[PDB]
């Protein structure tokens, strides 16, 4: 109803976040994972990203 | 406004160029505090009973 409370949010750092934690910053956007790097390091095992080399 | 800004002498480059440069420009890091890092300021201390209850 209130025609006053949004401005574009289609693109840029403001148009997304961490599916895990809201953070707009240091976002992993590759392969559609969309996790912030801090989180991605804590989840990378359960996602299936392991350490080989 | 803009009329002001162009009309204002005491502005632009020549004017700065002709001023001396302060010495705090060519300063140094500062540091302030470091050989106090291990020295606790809290003035509080714990106590063997509280630590022994905890751990």
């Amino acid at each position: 109803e209130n025609v006053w409370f949004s401005h574009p949010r289609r693109y840029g750092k403001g148009s997304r976040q961490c599916r895990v934690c809201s953070s707009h910053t240091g976002l992993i956007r590759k392969y559609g994972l969309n996790i912030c790097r801090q989180c991605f390091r804590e989840k990378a095992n359960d996602i299936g990203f392991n350490k080989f080399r | 406004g803009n009329e002001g800004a162009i009309r204002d002498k005491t502005a632009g480059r020549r004017n700065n160029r002709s001023k001396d440069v302060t010495d705090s420009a060519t300063t140094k890091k500062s540091n302030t505090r470091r050989a106090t890092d291990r020295h606790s300021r809290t003035g509080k201390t714990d106590t063997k009973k509280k630590v022994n209850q905890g751990w």
Binding site: - | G1, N2, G12
Partner: protein
Amino acid sequence: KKRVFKTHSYRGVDLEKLLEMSTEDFVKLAPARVRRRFARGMTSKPAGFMKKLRAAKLAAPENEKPAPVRTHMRNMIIVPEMIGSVVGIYNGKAFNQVEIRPEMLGHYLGEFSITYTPVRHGRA
């Protein structure tokens, strides 16, 4: 005499025609960036503004500048229809009152309102 000086020309058009030409025909003769801005976005833009603007130009006390008309629209391109108006061109705080001249055609409002105070190194 006879020759009351002579008018201005935007890019080969003397005032007279420019004034009653149409915004669209004006940008037609404008340069790249302008022609682009106007090309995209045609749905409601410098809207009530002009109305107010013109109303002020009517409410003008004769032979004199119309009252200022404040905006934040630093992005608005200057076109014939707004020639001879007075606009409060915000710079962050402050609306810088500016009258619009024939030779300002096609520039942004924001160019005419400075956004920072110069500098002044050293000094005291």
